[PDB]
Structure formats: structure tokens, C-alpha cells
Ligand SMILES: CC(C)=CCC/C(C)=C/CC/C(C)=C/CC/C=C(\C)CC/C=C(\C)CCC=C(C)C
Ligand SMILES: CC(C)=CCC/C(C)=C/CC/C(C)=C/CC/C=C(\C)CC/C=C(\C)CCC=C(C)C
Ligand SMILES: CC(C)=CCC/C(C)=C/CC/C(C)=C/CC/C=C(\C)CC/C=C(\C)CCC=C(C)C
Ligand SMILES: CCCCCCCCCO[C@@H]1O[C@H](CO)[C@@H](O)[C@H](O)[C@H]1O
Ligand SMILES: CCCCCCCCCO[C@@H]1O[C@H](CO)[C@@H](O)[C@H](O)[C@H]1O
Ligand SMILES: CCCCCCCCCO[C@@H]1O[C@H](CO)[C@@H](O)[C@H](O)[C@H]1O
Ligand SMILES: CCCCCCCCCO[C@@H]1O[C@H](CO)[C@@H](O)[C@H](O)[C@H]1O
């Protein structure tokens with residue numbers, strides 16, 4: 201590590217604040233749910249925001265930062281982003297999976313692709329060459345496309361077998377994931393990590409802040425909005 | 439790393455020895471169990487002690503040590519403790535979960551809180567500021583309280599629906615966890631990691647040695663004491 | 677890190693190429709399988725080769741390398757091997773487990789031993805003393821023997837309760853694992869990591885290349901060879 205933060209810390213704190221607020225919202229919002237199913241959604245969702253909050257606090261306090269050397273240039277890498285995504289992105293897919301009524305093979309595929317995506321993603325963040333970093337960015341992006349392919353394909357088909365409100369709910373959440381998630385690689389390739397520095401680290405941090413907040417608190421908020429629709433994921437009594 | 443051990447190694451070896459001995463005890467003690475349930479308890483428990491043993495051996499041989507710089511002072515951090523707890527603590531909760539007859543949402547919550555606890559715990563161990571380290575210690579301690587809240591609440595309620603001997607067994611094990619686990623953060627805050635050095639590293643190592651041994655070998659010994667009571671966790675035939 | 681590759685890179689590329697080719701083979705080979713079971717085998721298997729491919733590409737580009745100091749000598753460690761095995765070896769056992777018709781306790785034991793094996797294995801790769809490295813090599817090898825003991829024992833017994841073609845298929849795959857897996861520790865102890873340098877890093881890289889390819893692409897190829905036999909792992913309709 202041994203890297204100082206910078207003016208971007210403003211976004212890091214807003215992010216930390218937002219994630220912490222979403223968590224408390226979901227904790228109180230989840231208060232009183234007895235249905236074992238509705239609860240899953242609250243647990244998964246709540247863990248997504250608190251993890252994100254802790255990592256944002258890590259980058260804010262300067263813990264989740266480091267300096268990576270690449271071609272007579274020292275890039276500033278906020279690695280905590282990966283420790284965050286490594287856990288939160290698969291959970292988000294879990295949410296979608298459970299929402300769509302998908303089976304373990306599909307959900308396992310999604311999780312597997314996702315982890316491969318963040319893993320090759322952090323390799324890219326630390327690679328020692330503009331060529332190597334972009335190669336890895338390329339591997340990781342490929343995986344993103346492979347999992348998005350599962351979302352619009354098999355997963356979408358599963359959701360169509362769900363009650364209409366659930367299917368609708370899925371559609372929204374799926375489309376949110378598609379637009380938001382595709383933006384991450386773009387912000388990365390343009391930002392500091394891509395070695396091209398087209399998008400200043402200050403604005404890159406902000407971009408990731410808006411994305412993370414929308415992909416987690418926003419996502420969670422529309423997911424857990426209605427309790428009755430969410431319990432249509434299952435019909436029988438228990 | 440690049441840090442030398444010290445006089446505390448005596449405790450590290452005792453610890454290594456104890457954990458290795460508990461393992462062999464459980465391996466031989468588990469010999470002959472056919473009931474698929476009783477076995478779970480033996481597998482989980484046995485993995486707890488061998489993991490602990492390997493990590494204790496790691497700290498003993500000097501592998502699991504490092505030097506962390508914080509405020510013109512170089513703290514000695516035994517990070518292997520975290521690699522240990524990261525795996526053993528969730529397993530211990532698995533044991534309690536299975537013992538109480540808890541459902542996946544409760545057990546998943548416990549595991550999730552626990553991992554968050556050790557994760558923020560090791561961040562704290564490496565933070566670069568007395569203020570940051572204590573902040574993280576604070577986050578981690580909060581999580582400890584959140585999971586303890588689940589133990590005395592929901593988990594205790596589940597156990598009351600179990601056969602009386604199992605409920606009794608739970609009570610003991612739960613109370614053991616509560617008293618022992620609360621002591622870890624105290625030993626940490628007072629020891630070297632807390633930056634206050636109130637409790638010498640030599641005695642801190644001993645304290646953690648007694649705790650780990652009691653929280654694993656002791657715990658295991660009272661858990662796997664009786665085979666008949668343990669099989670009351672399930673009633674039907676198989 | 678900060679370590680340069682070397683003439684061994686030739687094997688690393690062949691390896692990268694082979695793993696990538698096996699993956700595409702399995703992806704296309706898995707095209708059209710609807711049976712939820714047959715699919716598991718394809719997903720698990722496919723993830724094994726792509727993980728291996730990415731790690732081989734990591735070592736090829738020099739990312740997965742580092743220099744470890746031990747006794748006035750600086751060893752060259754290809755750590756990516758461990759990040760690879762940490763995920764692929766447990767998956768391979770999953771394949772065998774599912775093939776044998778084993779229960780979760782057996783499969784969990786296998787996975788647990790396996791992870792302990794690679795974990796102590798990478799510790800050994802980084803230990804600071806010929807004596808410590810070999811001690812860990814010793815711990816890890818012990819675990820290898822413990823899991824091999826489960827393969828020829830309980831796992832083999834489970835497979836005998838399977839349809840004959842499945843039992844046969846198991847036998848092959850089990851024997852392949854036994855001969856191939858036992859060779860890893862030998863190649864390690866003789867290679868650079870063992871501190872004895874009996875087997876040059878150049879040939880060590882090749883040896884591991886042949887093993888990895890045989891233990892994954894070979895293994896996969898004989899596993900997924902026949903679709904009908906693989907669906908005999910389950911009989912009823914779904
Ligand atoms: C249906 C069923 C029973 C099973 C289905 C199959 C599953 C669940 C497969 C999962 C596969 C998975 C999660 C693969 C993950 C691969 C990720 C990596 C190899 C990551 C490597 C990261 C690094 C090497 C980071 C380096 C950092 C520094 C500072 C050097
Ligand atoms: C009921 C159901 C189907 C699912 C329920 C939900 C579950 C199981 C959620 C689990 C969540 C979980 C395990 C979160 C873990 C978070 C831990 C971290 C972010 C740890 C980070 C650690 C570091 C960053 C260490 C740094 C070390 C150095 C030397 C710099
Ligand atoms: C049947 C049922 C419900 C549960 C059964 C029990 C199970 C599944 C137990 C699993 C146990 C497990 C996976 C233990 C793993 C232990 C591995 C470690 C402690 C690894 C440590 C690695 C390091 C410390 C690497 C250091 C690297 C550097 C550069 C310093
Ligand atoms: C940087 C600040 C971040 C704050 C994050 C808190 C998110 C909670 C806001 O959710 C809103 O709660 C209302 C309850 O009255 C619902 O009616 C409405 O539909 C829902 O969208
Ligand atoms: C790392 C791998 C993690 C995989 C986690 C998968 C969660 C499995 C729970 O999903 C369930 O799967 C069944 C398959 O039969 C469906 O019928 C059911 O409707 C669906 O709710
Ligand atoms: C530093 C040394 C650590 C040694 C750890 C070994 C623990 C095994 C001792 O357990 C005891 O085994 C007896 C069997 O005769 C039981 O009757 C008794 O109830 C039980 O408590
Ligand atoms: C990282 C997440 C790990 C979660 C592991 C949870 C283990 C699930 C096994 O427990 C079982 O759950 C059922 C819920 O219906 C109960 O009815 C049953 O009595 C209980 O034995």
C-alpha cells in the first residue's frame with residue numbers, strides 16, 4: 201500500500217454514508233418478516249450494503265489503496281473495490297437467481313462466471329503492463345458478457361414462469377443490472393486503471409460511487425419494495 | 439513479514455501441541471460413528487482443531503508473523519490468527535446451528551456476521567492509525583454483539599424446541615461461546631494490536647492460547663461427549 | 677513479485693493453450709444437454725479448465741511469479757499454481773463425489789482435506805527455511821494421503837453401488853487421480869520449491885504442465901465421454 205487518498209475521498213465518504221444508510225434502511229425494513237423466503241432477500245440484500253459500506257470506509261480511511269508500478273508510471277489502485285465486488289456481486293446474482301426461480305446449475309454458473317470476472321478483474325488492476333492489464337480487462341469483460349448472456353437467456357426464461365408481478369420485478373432488476381454492470385468496464389478502461397487516464401481519478405471515483413449505490417441500494421430498494429409480490433416466489437404454506 | 443518470534447513462542451508451541459492432541463482425540467473418538475448427523479459434528483469439530491493446529495504451527499515457526507507500522511511505532515502482528523478464525527469460527531457456529539436445529543437463514547446470518555467480524559478484525563490489525571485500528575475494532579466488535587444477539591435470541595429459541603438433553607447441551611455451549619468470545623476483543627484492545635500495549639505480547643499470546651484451546655478443544659470435548667444425546671438432534675430412522 | 681519468467685515460459689504457453697482448448701471443447705461438448713445432472717458434470721469440469729487456463733496465462737505473462745528468500749538463496753515461486761489448485765482440485769473431487777454417489781459428509785471431508793492440502797502447500801512454497809518448507813510439504817502430503825485413503829475406501833465403496841458402467845468410469849478416474857496426484861509432491865520436493873534443485877525449474881514446469889493437462893483435460897475427456905453412462909448416476913424421471 202503506502203498510498204495517500206486524495207480529493208476523491210469526498211465520493212468515498214458519500215459512498216460510505218450511502219451504503220451505511222441503505223443497510224439501516226433494510227435492517228429496519230426487514231423487521232417483522234417471518235416468511236422464510238422473504239427473509240432470504242433481506243439477509244442477502246443487507247449483507248450486500250454492509251460489505252459495501254465497510255469497503256467504502258476502508259478506501260475512505262486510506263486502507264484500501266495501493267500503488268502499482270506499470271511502465272515508468274505509478275498507478276493508484278483502490279483494490280478494496282475488488283474485495284467488495286468479490287462478495288457483493290455474487291450475492292446480487294443470488295437475489296436475481298432466487299427471484300427468477302432458477303435452479304442450482306444456473307445460479308452456480310452465474311456465481312462462477314461472476315467470481316472469475318472479479319478475479320481476473322483484480323489481476324488486471326495489478327498487471328504490470330498496459331498490454332497485460334487490457335488483456336485481463338478483456339478476459340474479465342468476456343466473462344461479464346457470458347453471464348449477461350445467461351441473464352437475458354435462461355434466467356429470463358425462468359422468470360417468465362413466475363407470477364406476473366415477479367416476472368415484472370425481475371425485468372426491472374435484470375435491465376438495471378445490464379445497463380449498470382456494462383458501465384463498470386467502461387469506467388475502468390477510461391480511468392486510471394486502464395493506463396490511459398482519459399477519465400480523472402476524481403471523476404472515476406464518483407462514477408463508481410453512483411454505480412455502486414444504484415447497483416446495491418437502488419437495486420435493493422426496488423427488490424424489497426413490496427412484501428406480497430416477493431412472497432409469490434413461493435405459493436404453498438409453511 | 440520479516441518479523442522474529444520471541445519469548446511468546448512457548449505459548450504458540452503449547453497451543454500447537456494442544457490443538458494437534460485435540461484433533462487426534464476427535465479422530466479416534468469419531469471412529470465407528472455411522473449415523474449421518476453424529477458424523478457432521480465430528481467432521482466440523484475435527485476440522486476446527488486441525489486448522490487451528492496448522493496455524494499455531496505457522497505462528498510458532500515464525501511464518502504467521504509480520505511487522506505493521508503505525509505512528510512511528512512498529513507493531514508485531516500475528517496475522518495467522520485471522521486465517522485461523524476466518525474458517526474455524528464459522529464452523530463453530532455451524533456446530534451450534536446444527537445443534538440448535540436452526541434453519542439456513544439463521545445459520546447463514548451467523549456465518550455472515552462472523553466472517554464480517556474476522557474480516558474487519560484483520561483490517562483493524564493492519565490499519566495504519568491508532569484511531570483507524572480502534573474504529574475497525576469497533577466495527578468488528580459491533581458484529582460480535584450482533585451475532586451474540588442471535589445466539590441468545592433466535593438460536594436459543596430454536597434449541598428450546600429440541601430434546602431436553604440437547605437443549606441443555608446447547609445452553610452450556612452457548613454460554614461458553616458468550617463468555618469466551620467476548621474476551622477476545624478485550625485481549626486485543628489491551629494487547630499489542632490495540633496500540634496501547636497495556637497487556638504485554640507475551641501474556642497476550644498466552645491469553646489467546648487459553649481462549650483458543652477452550653473455545654475449540656474444550657468446546658469440542660463437551661459437544662461430542664455423548665453420542666446418544668447428539669443423535670437426538672434427529673429422531674426418524676435412516 | 678518482481679520476478680522474471682524464463683525459458684520455462686514455453687511450457688506455460690502450451691499449458692495455457694491446452695487448458696483454453698479443453699474449455700472450448702467442453703463448452704461445445706456441453707451444448708444441448710438438458711438433463712440436470714449431466715450438466716453439473718459439464719459446469720464443474722468446464723470451470724476447472726478455464727480457471728487453469730487463466731492461471732496458466734497469469735504465470736505465462738509473469739503475473740503469477742515471485743521471489744522467495746530462503747537461506748542466502750532466492751527461490752523462484754510460481755504461486756499462481758496454488759490459486760489454481762485451491763479451486764480446481766476441490767471441483768475435481770466434486771466430480772468424483774457426484775460420480776460415486778457419495779453423501780455430503782464424504783464430499784465435505786474430501787473438499788476439506790483438499791483445501792487444507794493446497795493451503796499448507798502454499799505455506800510450504802513460501803516458508804523461509806529448508807526445514808520449514810519440508811515440514812509443511814510433510815503436513816500437506818499427509819493430507820493428500822488422508823484424502824486418497826477416502827478415495828480407495830469409502831468413495832470406492834459408494835461407486836460399487838452405482839450402475840456397472842458408472843462404477844467402471846469411477847475406477848478409471850479414481851486410478852488416474854491416484855497416480856497423477858501422488859506425482860505432484862514428488863515434482864515439488866525435487867524441483868526448485870524443495871530447495872534441493874534436483875529437477876531444473878525448466879523441466880519442473882513441464883512436468884507440472886503434463887500433470888495439470890492430464891488431471892484436467894484428460895480427466896474431463898474421459899469423464900464426459902459418454903452421455904448415457906453419465907445419466908445412470910440418477911435413474912428416475914424429472
Ligand atoms: C451445480 C454444482 C453442484 C457445482 C457448480 C460449479 C461451481 C459453483 C464452480 C465455481 C468456480 C469458481 C468460483 C472459480 C473462481 C476463480 C477465481 C480465481 C482463480 C481468482 C484469482 C485472483 C488472484 C490471483 C488475485 C491476486 C492479487 C495480488 C495482490 C497479487
Ligand atoms: C439464506 C441464503 C441462501 C443466503 C444468505 C446470505 C449469506 C450466506 C451472506 C454471506 C456474506 C459474507 C460471508 C460477507 C463477508 C465480508 C468480508 C470482507 C469484505 C473481508 C475483507 C478482508 C480484507 C480486505 C483483508 C486485508 C489484508 C491485508 C494484508 C491488506
Ligand atoms: C457436512 C457439513 C454440513 C460440513 C462439513 C465440514 C467442512 C466443509 C469443513 C471445511 C474446512 C476447510 C475448507 C479448511 C481450510 C483450511 C485452509 C487454511 C487455514 C489456508 C491458509 C493459507 C495461507 C496462510 C497462505 C499464505 C500466503 C502468503 C503470501 C503469506
Ligand atoms: C445518500 C443517502 C442514501 C439514502 C439511502 C436510503 C434509501 C431509502 C429510501 O427508500 C425509499 O423509502 C420510502 C419509505 O417511506 C419508500 O416509500 C420509497 O419507495 C423508497 O424508495
Ligand atoms: C457456489 C454455488 C452456490 C449455489 C447456490 C444455489 C442455491 C440453490 C437454491 O435454489 C433452488 O434450486 C432448486 C433446484 O432444483 C430450484 O428448484 C428452486 O426453485 C431454487 O430456489
Ligand atoms: C495440552 C494437552 C491437551 C490435551 C487435549 C486432549 C483432550 C481429551 C481429553 O478429554 C477427556 O477424555 C476422557 C476419555 O477417557 C473423557 O472421559 C472426558 O470426559 C474428556 O474430557
Ligand atoms: C454460507 C452459508 C452456509 C449455510 C449452511 C446452512 C446449513 C443448512 C442445514 O441446516 C438445516 O436447515 C433446514 C432449513 O429448512 C432445517 O429445517 C434443518 O433442521 C437444518 O438442519
Ligand SMILES: CCCCCCCCCO[C@@H]1O[C@H](CO)[C@@H](O)[C@H](O)[C@H]1O
Pocket residue numbers: 693694697698701893897
Ligand atoms: C494441446 C492441445 C490440447 C487439445 C485438447 C482438446 C481435447 C479434445 C480431444 O478429445 C477427443 O475428442 C473426440 C471427438 O471427435 C473424441 O472422439 C475422443 O474420444 C476425445 O478424446
Ligand SMILES: CCCCCCCCCO[C@@H]1O[C@H](CO)[C@@H](O)[C@H](O)[C@H]1O
Pocket residue numbers: 774777778779780783784787
Ligand atoms: C464445502 C462443502 C461442499 C459439499 C458439497 C456436497 C454436495 C451435496 C450433493 O450430493 C448429494 O448428497 C446426498 C446426501 O444425502 C446424497 O444422497 C446424494 O446422492 C448426493 O448426490
Ligand SMILES: *C/C=C(C)/C=C/C=C(C)/C=C/C1=C(C)CCCC1(C)C
Pocket residue numbers: 252285288289292317318320321322324336337338340341342344381382384385388412415416
Ligand atoms: C456493487 C457492485 C457491483 C454490482 C459491481 C460490478 C462490477 C462489474 C460488473 C465489473 C466489471 C469489470 C470488467 C468486465 C473488466 C475489468 C474490470 C472490472 C472489474 C471493472
Ligand SMILES: *C/C=C(C)/C=C/C=C(C)/C=C/C1=C(C)CCCC1(C)C
Pocket residue numbers: 490523526527530555556558559560562574575576578579580582619620622623626650653654
Ligand atoms: C477458535 C477461535 C475463536 C472462537 C476466535 C474467536 C474470536 C473472536 C470472537 C474475535 C473478535 C474480535 C473483535 C470483536 C474485535 C477486533 C478484533 C478481534 C478479531 C480479536
Ligand SMILES: *C/C=C(C)/C=C/C=C(C)/C=C/C1=C(C)CCCC1(C)C
Pocket residue numbers: 728761764765768793794796797798800812813814816817818820857858860861864888891892
Ligand atoms: C489440476 C491440478 C491438480 C489436480 C493438482 C493437484 C496437486 C496436488 C495433489 C498437490 C500436492 C502437494 C503436496 C502433497 C505437498 C506440498 C506441495 C503440493 C502442493 C505440490
